[PDB]
């Protein structure tokens, strides 16, 4: 229909004027009286081998010791990142994965891929009983990010534009977060564990909330798809990491951009973003085996982590900030410090 | 140590499981939904079918449950042996299969792999154009009305937009639905593709 879409674009121009009215100065206009970080040079410590195909995602444990990895062979391997042991190596049903997660209670393991099923493995239960506890069916389209907000509730992305919630005790999808137009690629739960922002393939992130189910805010300002977002650890901001080589730091309660992180030599796509412990270093994984850092207070780069030759598919820092594990398509995980 | 011996046993198990899947040949078939899939896989995630014929083991990946836009999950098949199209023969979906063939023959992830195309459902198609020709939705393009040249006209439409600056030959087979040599054609094709990469793997080509 013509009239409702005309009303929609009229109120969209109203939203654009309302966002015009507030933007007087960005972060790089008020940060101009601080000290810079300086060119850091952190090398690897544990070049960790054991994969034979390309890997896709990882997640640290809460105790900052146990690592997880998922790849295109049927492996759901849990490592110890202190002496490079392999604590578990789960053979799962579908060889194709897309994501994985480690529970905040350190007890369960979530995984999933384009088998349209997020599966929960009951880690360290009994005498070698590393088994699938539940499988979360009732979910059309491929899956891109499972994340625990508890030991009993998961929030999983979708191919059919949802960000649904799951109760593991009965397997039933309680709430569904519809409202996107493209498929949702990543999530990042808040430290409040009541809000979560999700990015998708229509250049728009959405800040949902767990209880009332309504999308409270939708952030635009990108061009291509948004691959992997990460939340800033106060509860007020998040980085985006889109496909047009532009990590953008957005905020809450003002809905506009805070900064953009791009210059002319950055060409390829971005597919993994995670902050530091305080947030001074935004760690961004690129597509030209050149996962770099970004000083996310002065909008300039401060070092690269060139130790691969393929797509750096995933990265993640610990809860105490003492490390960063970067996993790529060359079957390796380089743990930098 | 106990945990170190457990890690070494796990690494031995992973290396032993490496050789089982490092020997098979994996294939994918797009087919655009309605096709003659249900015969060539007979002979809602990833429907994996697994057959073998004369010391070659195959693992098809019939992905149909996913949505229409597929720019985000198509890079996980970069490393497949040969794409298997399943274009049905029903003129005026016919058009949506041709738009998918443009996309996979222009991107970096599939500009070195082969395409084993299949013109399908011939005995339906031979009677479907015996009375209603191809020269209604198009102009007078064929020039005649049989099943040989009009079957070859769909082949020259698909081969019109292939770049092929490397080893990217496109086999084709006007196949029926009661065929008995269909799996021999996919065996005879994939041995030729295996020879071309092994000739490339040794280097002399």
């Amino acid at each position: 229909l013509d009239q409702l879409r005309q009303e929609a674009e009229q109120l969209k121009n109203q939203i654009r004027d309302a966002r015009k009215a507030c933007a007087d100065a960005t972060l790089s206009q008020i940060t101009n009286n601080i000290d810079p970080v300086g060119r850091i040079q952190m090398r690897t410590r544990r070049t960790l081998r054991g994969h034979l195909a390309k890997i896709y995602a990882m997640h640290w444990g809460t105790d900052s010791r146990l690592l997880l990895s998922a790849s295109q062979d049927g492996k759901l391997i849990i490592w110890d990142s202190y002496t490079t042991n392999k604590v578990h190596a789960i053979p799962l049903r579908s060889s194709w994965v897309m994501t994985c997660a480690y529970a905040p209670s350190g007890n369960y393991v979530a995984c999933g891929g384009l088998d349209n099923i997020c599966s929960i493995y009951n880690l360290k239960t009994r005498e070698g009983n590393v088994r699938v506890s539940r499988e979360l069916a009732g979910h059309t389209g491929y899956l891109s990010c499972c994340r625990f907000l508890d030991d009993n509730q998961i929030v999983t992305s979708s191919g059919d534009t949802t960000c649904a919630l799951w109760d593991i005790e009965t397997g039933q999808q309680t709430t569904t977060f519809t409202g996107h137009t493209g498929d949702v690629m990543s999530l990042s739960l808040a430290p409040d564990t009541r809000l979560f922002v999700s990015g998708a393939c229509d250049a728009s992130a959405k800040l949902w909330d767990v209880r009332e189910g309504m999308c409270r805010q939708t952030f635009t300002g990108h061009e291509s798809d948004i691959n992997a977002i990460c939340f800033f650890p106060n509860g007020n901001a998040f980085a985006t990491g889109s496909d047009d080589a532009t990590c953008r730091l957005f905020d809450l309660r003002a809905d506009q951009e805070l900064m953009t992180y791009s210059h002319d030599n950055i060409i390829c796509g971005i597919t993994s973003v995670s902050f530091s412990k305080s947030g001074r270093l935004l760690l961004a994984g690129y597509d030209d085996f050149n996962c770099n850092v970004w000083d996310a207070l002065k909008a300039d780069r401060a070092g690269v982590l060139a130790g691969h030759d393929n797509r750096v598919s995933c990265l993640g820092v610990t809860d105490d900030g003492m490390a960063v594990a970067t996993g790529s398509w060359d079957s390796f995980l380089k743990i930098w410090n | 140590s106990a945990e170190e011996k457990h890690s070494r046993e796990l690494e031995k198990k992973l290396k032993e499981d490496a050789e089982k899947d490092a020997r098979t040949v994996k294939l994918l078939l797009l087919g655009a939904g309605e096709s003659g899939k249900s015969t060539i896989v007979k002979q809602t995630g990833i429907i994996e079918t697994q057959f073998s014929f004369k010391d070659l083991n195959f693992r098809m990946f019939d992905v149909g449950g996913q949505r229409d836009e597929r720019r985000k999950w198509i890079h996980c098949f970069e490393g497949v042996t040969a794409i298997i199209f399943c274009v049905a023969l029903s003129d005026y979906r016919m058009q949506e299969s041709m738009n998918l063939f443009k996309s996979i023959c222009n991107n970096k992830w599939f500009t070195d792999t082969s395409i084993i195309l299949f013109l399908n459902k011939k005995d339906l198609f031979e009677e479907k154009i015996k009375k209603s020709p191809l020269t209604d939705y198009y102009p007078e393009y064929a020039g005649s009305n049989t099943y040989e040249e009009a079957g070859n006209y769909i082949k020259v439409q698909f081969l019109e937009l292939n770049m092929a600056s490397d080893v990217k030959e496109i086999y084709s087979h006007m196949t029926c639905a009661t065929d008995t040599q269909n799996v021999k054609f996919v065996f005879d094709a994939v041995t030729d593709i295996i020879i071309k990469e092994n000739l490339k793997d040794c280097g002399l080509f």
Partner: nanobody
Framework: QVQLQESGGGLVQPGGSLRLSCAAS????????MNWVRQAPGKGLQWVSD????????SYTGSVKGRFTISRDDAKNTLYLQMNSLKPADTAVYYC?????????????????????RGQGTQVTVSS
């Protein structure tokens, strides 16, 4: 957002030329590969034109080889298609799509339904 508005579609007797254009607003219109897609009255979407970033690589579909022309005016931020000697088998609607990844020759889902990076297009009907 990514706005792709178009103009230049009406009724035309066959053989007569018709020039239509896409004004883009929302991104940098210098480093995205661009496509022109049509959709018949009833049939599915069909890709027509495949103009690259600079202007070197230019492709066409099967039914159109030597009757449509395409040009991106970078400074005016506009894509241009022109139909010279069109046939009455084109009573379509016309969208202009942008390929998703910049700096890349990939145009993978510019023809898909419910796609996010193409405008509502114009209507091209043909008389006789």
């Amino acid at each position: 957002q990514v706005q792709l508005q178009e103009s230049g579609g009406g009724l035309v007797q066959p053989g007569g030329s018709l020039r239509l254009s896409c004004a883009a607003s929302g991104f940098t219109f210098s480093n995205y590969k661009m496509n022109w897609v049509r959709q018949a009255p009833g049939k599915g979407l069909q890709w027509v034109s495949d103009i690259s970033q600079s202007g070197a690589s230019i492709s066409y579909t099967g039914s159109v080889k030597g009757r449509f022309t395409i040009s991106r005016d970078d400074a005016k931020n506009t894509l241009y298609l022109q139909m010279n000697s069109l046939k009455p088998a084109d009573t379509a609607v016309y969208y202009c799509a942008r390929c998703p990844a910049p700096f890349t020759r990939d145009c993978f889902d510019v023809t898909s339904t419910a796609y996010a990076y193409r405008g509502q297009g114009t209507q091209v009907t043909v008389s006789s």
